[PDB]
Design a protein around this ligand. Structure first.
Ligand SMILES: [Cl-]
Ligand SMILES: [Cl-]
Ligand SMILES: [Zn+2]
Ligand SMILES: [Zn+2]
Ligand SMILES: [Zn+2]
Ligand SMILES: [Zn+2]
Ligand SMILES: [Zn+2]
Ligand SMILES: [Zn+2]
Ligand SMILES: [Zn+2]
Length: 375
């Protein structure tokens, strides 16, 4: 929408959070170094009223060794948010990635998953659950008065619609999920809000498996307040109709919905990326703008069911999507972006994606104009 509109500095553009302030908060995922960068700081002050850490609140960053807690980086994000009136989300208490391996070792230092004795397996389950509770207790006791929204567990349902068979699940079963939520509620009180977080929440059979899991846990009294939808999506997929059905489905259980990691990749999956930002054709940015136009129109339609929409980054100069931006080369060394075309080699994670409404020079993209207007 409206490529007529100019590529002005985002520091001079109408504020994104103020455009949506009655519908939902507008968030950005950050690294602490960006709080020391003048442009990123001004971007956060101008456009965003919610914040989340893309990495430094993950388990391995918080307690990389048992009893060694590193809150210095998380503290910096919390302090910045409080100074600028931003909501904070905690990402994430429990996850099968970026998770220190000391969690899953028995008292003799061996992997708990290897244990065959059922009496010892049960001892390992209780030990793991105690470590889990202490990790959550220490974090929530420090942050309960500052951080309102909590991703308690992340990606606990596999894409095959079964519970993901992580060490958490192999060792403790489903109880690691119940213990995580119960611990957060106990040490954090009734005022913090507890989410189950996942990607591809729109996609069956994962969607209904997540639905069934949360419905059953709440029937058993496990405190779950909402669903965190990562929304790492594409220009075409998933369809707005399927996003809408997903949001409505979870809202019917009385759950809040938060969009916690929104980015609109320029590519399919697996991605065949352009090697640089400059190689991306203008038309892709128009396609992305029209997708963003439909997407935020749908979010507004559903604003009574969505409290927050967070982008997984600030501007196109920095996005975890670049780690997936594989560049394919044919035999003559030219770039291949057609998903079915011949190619000879791939350079994994060497290309550039362009997923946000702000460009890498901090000027607004057509996608920005598409979502700042009221059409
Ligand atoms: Cl309004
Ligand atoms: Cl990143
Ligand atoms: Zn308005
Ligand atoms: Zn309104
Ligand atoms: Zn603001
Ligand atoms: Zn995550
Ligand atoms: Zn990053
Ligand atoms: Zn629009
Ligand atoms: Zn307006």
């Amino acid at each position: 929408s409206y490529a007529k509109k100019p590529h002005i500095s985002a520091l001079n553009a109408p504020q994104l959070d103020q455009r949506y302030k009655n519908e939902f908060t507008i968030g950005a995922a950050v690294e602490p170094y960006q709080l020391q960068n003048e442009k990123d700081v001004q971007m956060l002050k101008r456009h965003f009223n919610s914040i989340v850490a893309e990495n430094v609140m993950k388990p391995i960053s918080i307690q990389p060794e048992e009893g060694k807690f590193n809150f210095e980086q998380a503290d910096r994000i919390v302090k910045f948010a409080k100074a600028n009136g931003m909501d904070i989300r905690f990402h994430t208490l429990v996850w099968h990635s970026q998770v220190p391996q000391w969690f899953f070792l028995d008292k003799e230092g061996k992997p708990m998953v290897n244990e065959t004795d059922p009496v010892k397996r049960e001892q390992n389950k209780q030990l793991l659950l105690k470590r889990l509770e202490t990790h959550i207790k220490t974090i929530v006791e420090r942050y309960k008065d500052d951080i309102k929204y909590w991703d308690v567990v992340e990606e606990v349902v596999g894409d095959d619609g079964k519970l993901r068979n992580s060490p958490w699940y192999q060792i403790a079963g489903i109880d690691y999920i119940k213990v995580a939520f119960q611990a957060a509620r106990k040490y954090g009180g009734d005022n913090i809000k507890l989410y189950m977080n996942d990607y591809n929440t729109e996609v069956e059979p994962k969607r209904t498996a997540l639905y069934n899991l949360v419905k059953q846990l709440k029937e058993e009294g496990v405190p779950i307040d909402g669903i965190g939808h990562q929304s790492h999506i594409q220009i075409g997929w998933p369809s707005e109709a399927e996003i809408e059905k997903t949001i409505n489905m979870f809202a019917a259980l009385g759950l809040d919905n938060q969009i916690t990691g929104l980015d609109v990749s320029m590519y399919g999956w697996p991605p065949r990326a352009y090697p640089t930002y400059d190689a991306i054709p203008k038309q892709k940015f128009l396609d992305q703008a029209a997708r963003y136009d439909r997407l935020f129109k749908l979010y507004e339609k559903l604003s009574d069911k969505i409290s927050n929409v967070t982008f997984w980054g600030i501007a196109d100069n920095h996005t975890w999507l670049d780690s997936r931006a594989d560049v394919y080369y044919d035999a003559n060394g030219n770039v291949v972006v057609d998903p079915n075309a011949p190619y000879a080699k791939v350079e994994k994670g060497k290309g550039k994606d362009a997923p946000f409404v702000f460009g890498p020079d901090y000027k607004v993209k057509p996608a920005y104009w598409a979502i700042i207007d009221h059409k």
